[PDB]
From a paper:
Here, we present the structure of WcbL from Burkholderia pseudomallei. A critical step in the synthesis of heptoses is their 1-O phosphorylation, mediated by kinases such as HldE or WcbL. We report that WcbL operates through a sequential ordered Bi-Bi mechanism, loading the heptose first and then ATP. The protein forms a head-to-tail dimer, with the two active sites facing away from the dimer interface, in line with the native molecular weight predicted from size-exclusion chromatography.
Furthermore, soaking of native crystals with glycerol or mannose showed that these two sugars both bind in the sugar-phosphate binding pocket, where the sugar is expected. The glycerol and mannose complex crystals had a higher proportion of the monoclinic cell: these data could be processed, and the models refined well in both space groups. However, ligand electron density was significantly better in the orthorhombic space group for both of these complexes, and therefore all structures were refined in the orthorhombic cell.
Numbering used by the authors:
A (entry chain B), B (entry chain B): 2 to 346
Write the structure that this text describes.
């Protein structure tokens, strides 16, 4: 009789500092990110099989099937992440002996949403295997493994914050240094501050961003090619992540919104495609309706936007955003990181 | 210097039994409802004023302003609920002496959403006053007061479940008897059951329902006018709420979905406008895409629908619903009831 495992990991809002976690910047100056997990999840399922095969199923429903071999699976460009997590687990915890199983994923947000889904999906696949094989991997180790699987094994360029939000959960201030050294600072925010923040945030999905890889490439180039003004914009991204972190610990909403405004300007100045005229139209309209600050959640170029609005103008802002292309949502934070459960055996 | 209070209360999904809480049925046979609060809120704010006036502001931004009188405010049909909560509090806890304040509300869902917003708004106004005046009102007393304010003071006909979900929070099985006697049974659902349920639910907002008052009138008439077959449909609504409650406590998803299917048929049979061809088109399409069961969340006729779908068909269902008019969402439950916090003094 088969075993069925599921795992989930929360997606995240980037509140401040995104862009300082790109490789050249973090390694050279040190990065800061402030982020927080929300009520939307990536999921992985492992089902053991009775036939001698391995099957991989993805969120946009790609599907690969292989027979049982004592060789690592080739990373041929179809479902490389699923195959790489599988390869790592078989090599390191099953003495290279294949396991007949189906590894499937799905997600509450599509690719390009600005919610860290790509890396959250790797975390959740790892967490399902942690449950399957009863592995003693702690949170730092799961997040580091996810990072290595995606960026080294699979050679995919990107940031360093999403692995940690998906694993740890809650509100975190992260410090990124050279040689893969990351410090996660879980923030002990007062209950009234959390309720006030949720009461003042409105989320707006603008559509799929296709700029992430480009923006991250540009931000990396800023440092490597010594683009002075753009590097200074990134230094401002960093400074404001710390100001925003302190504002939250102090329950200082005036400083929070001032820091989001300055941070949004810096983020736009760091890479050309972070914003565009369409996003700027939405932003301007939100501000007109009474929003005090806002930003694009991930690298930029589309995906989710978030707005800070005083409660007396919240419904006005909600009404206005209805006039634009996209979907409005409230913002609800989650405190828990990745978790797994069993359905059969 | 002024005082600023905010309160919030979670909205709810009706999982089973809705319709058995209408007055004639509950009073005659006893009602059962299974419901659960979600990650969307109604809000109230009280701001004390320095001028001698009282102001009321609503979710669709109606606004009323009065000067200070030692007479109860008239319920003239504009913002009656705000005025009635204010009248009750001034009479019973301030010896009839007016208080200069502004009472405002807003909500994460509009009227007719099938999420219990109308009554949740009354609860949250009450909770803001509990915080303002430091009242020792327990949960049963807040829910009962909300019920009386809406149905007696304001003479608005309706159900009995929403006041209790908004106040208590979490997953509750409620028993409704004659003479306003209600038993709330908070359900201790296992963590894996809650995660599995969220992983298997998809929400779909179909638009504003304008049928609530009609459906509740029809269900009440069923009992009063001895409409035999329609009363039997309501008896089936009741039976399946208990089966569904037991299925959740036992972690029995097969029984859960069987009970939702039988309960949806009964609900449709109890009142003519519970469903229509448009809702039925959506339902049929969801089932085609792989959903195993579903229903309209509130009284019926529109608002939110919820679907139970096995995880391997979840993305398919999500894609399909995209083809219809409405907005797809995941389902995240909240465990907490109504809560308040302070911003000034
Ligand atoms: Cl970000
Ligand atoms: Cl950011
Ligand atoms: Cl994303
Ligand atoms: Cl992202
Ligand atoms: Cl209901
Ligand atoms: Cl129901
Ligand atoms: Cl509603
Ligand atoms: Cl409702």
């Amino acid at each position: 009789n088969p075993t069925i495992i599921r795992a989930r990991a929360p997606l995240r809002l980037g509140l401040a500092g995104g862009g300082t976690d790109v490789a050249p910047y973090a390694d050279t100056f040190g990065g800061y990110v402030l982020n927080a997990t929300i009520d939307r999840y990536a999921y992985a399922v492992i089902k053991t099989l009775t036939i001698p095969a391995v099957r991989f199923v993805s969120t946009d429903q790609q599907v690969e099937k292989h027979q049982l071999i004592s060789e690592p699976l080739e990373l041929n460009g179809t479902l490389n992440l699923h195959k790489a997590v599988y390869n790592h687990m078989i090599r390191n915890y099953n003495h290279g002996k294949p396991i007949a199983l189906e590894l499937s994923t799905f997600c509450d947000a599509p690719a390009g949403s600005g919610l860290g889904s790509s890396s959250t999906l790797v975390v959740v696949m790892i967490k399902a295997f942690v449950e399957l094989l009863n592995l003693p991997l702690d949170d730092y180790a799961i997040a580091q493994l996810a990072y290595r699987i995606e960026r080294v094994d699979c050679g995919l360029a990107g940031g360093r914050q999403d692995q940690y939000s998906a694993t740890f959960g809650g509100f975190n201030f992260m410090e990124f240094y050279e040689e893969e050294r990351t410090i996660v600072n879980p923030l002990r925010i007062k209950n009234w501050v959390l309720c006030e923040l949720e009461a003042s945030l409105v989320l707006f999905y603008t559509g799929v961003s296709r700029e992430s890889a480009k923006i991250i490439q540009d931000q990396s180039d800023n440092v490597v090619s010594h683009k002075t003004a753009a590097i200074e914009a990134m230094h401002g991204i960093k400074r404001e992540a710390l100001v925003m972190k302190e504002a939250l610990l102090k329950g200082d909403f005036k400083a929070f919104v001032a820091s989001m405004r300055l941070g949004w300007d810096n983020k736009k100045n760091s890479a050309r495609t972070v914003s565009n005229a369409h996003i700027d139209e939405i932003y301007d309209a939100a501000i007109r309706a009474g929003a005090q600050a806002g930003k694009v959640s991930g690298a930029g170029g589309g995906g989710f936007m978030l707005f800070f609005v005083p409660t007396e103008k919240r419904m006005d802002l909600i009404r206005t955003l209805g006039e634009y292309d996209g979907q409005v949502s409230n913002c609800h934070f989650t405190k828990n990181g990745t978790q797994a459960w069993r359905i059969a055996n």
